[PDB]
Design an enzyme around this catalytic site. Structure first.
Site, PDB file in Angstrom:
ATOM      1  CE1 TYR A 140      37.551 -25.680  38.422  1.00 26.67           C
ATOM      2  CE2 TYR A 140      37.068 -24.346  36.487  1.00 26.67           C
ATOM      3  CZ  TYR A 140      37.081 -24.507  37.862  1.00 26.67           C
ATOM      4  OH  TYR A 140      36.626 -23.492  38.674  1.00 26.67           O
ATOM      5  CG  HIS A 194      37.453 -18.572  31.232  1.00 24.56           C
ATOM      6  ND1 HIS A 194      38.539 -18.336  32.046  1.00 24.56           N
ATOM      7  CD2 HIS A 194      37.060 -17.363  30.767  1.00 24.56           C
ATOM      8  CE1 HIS A 194      38.790 -17.040  32.075  1.00 24.56           C
ATOM      9  NE2 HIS A 194      37.907 -16.428  31.308  1.00 24.56           N
TER      10      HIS A 194
END
Lengths: 126, 130
Positions: free
Chosen positions: B16, B93
């Protein structure tokens, strides 16, 4: 180096003026170390042309559309052709009340006009 | 003055961001200083723990930068908890989630998705000048 800040239907109207924001966007772009062709329109055809150019050039895009945000498959299609980063920006918060978001690299909503200057900062550092 | 930066389930299992948590937690604090803020960067998989931190920030009237994990999509509690926030809440995010529906977004002041770990720093930068 070159960044395209493209704006859409109901943004020619737009607490800032046409062209407070362009000036705000342009100097900040400068301060970061970029050039921001700031462009606005009220028709999809004019809009799509600038997207194809960015794809044809591979030049990053900052896109905000108002009315063609949640209606335009055409705008989604052209944005799929974009080689270089595409950051969707929105001034208002749409979530309390989008086509591109699965084709955008990233999105920023609800941070006013500073959304534009934050997007820049990403692109510059990236 | 004080910015609460909270992280939800699975976010300490990064690795990520490319970057890990420990690294992340320092960098945010690092970049917070130069903006003139104290980034209280937390995380836990406990939904209870998180909500407490939300209440804490609600009682204190502090801005939050929230990155829930899988609770962001599933959890009513978390929206009621966030619905208590008076000062800004920026939802962040690392990936581009567009999972396309997020509970927090309709009551968050703003959102930042898909800009990596830099969304945090861009979120901080809105709070500085707002």
């Amino acid at each position: 180096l070159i960044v395209n800040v493209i704006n859409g239907p109901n943004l020619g109207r737009l607490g800032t003026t046409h062209d407070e924001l362009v000036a705000l966007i342009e100097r900040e772009a400068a301060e970061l170390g970029l050039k921001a062709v700031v462009r606005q329109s009220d028709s999809e055809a004019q809009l799509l042309d600038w997207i194809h150019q960015a794809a044809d050039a591979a030049e990053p895009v900052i896109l905000n559309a108002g009315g063609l945000t949640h209606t335009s498959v055409a705008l989604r299609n052209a944005c799929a052709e974009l080689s270089a980063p595409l950051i969707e920006v929105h001034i208002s918060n749409v979530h309390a009340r989008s086509y591109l978001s699965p084709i955008a690299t990233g999105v920023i909503v609800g941070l006013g006009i500073q959304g534009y200057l934050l997007a820049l900062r990403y692109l510059a550092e990236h």
